[PDB]
């Protein structure tokens, strides 16, 4: 029933989230901050099932 009724999903794409993270975490590029590196490899192909 949930699958049949919950048709779409609402979320913000990755680009905006990365921009916000960059603005909030004002750090020079070329410094190897793993907080920024880890998120850069994400995606939301699977959001409906989750």
């Amino acid at each position: 029933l949930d699958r049949a009724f919950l048709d779409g999903v609402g979320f913000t794409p990755l680009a905006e989230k990365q921009q916000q993270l960059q603005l909030q975490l004002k750090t020079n590029i070329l410094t190897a901050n793993l907080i920024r590196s880890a998120i850069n490899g994400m995606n939301t192909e699977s959001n409906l099932e989750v």
Binding site: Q18, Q22, I29, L30, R36, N40
Partner: peptide, 12 residues
Amino acid sequence: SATGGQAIRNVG
């Protein structure tokens, strides 16, 4: 081969 060159992947 002699001069290593790296680049930023997707932060660009």
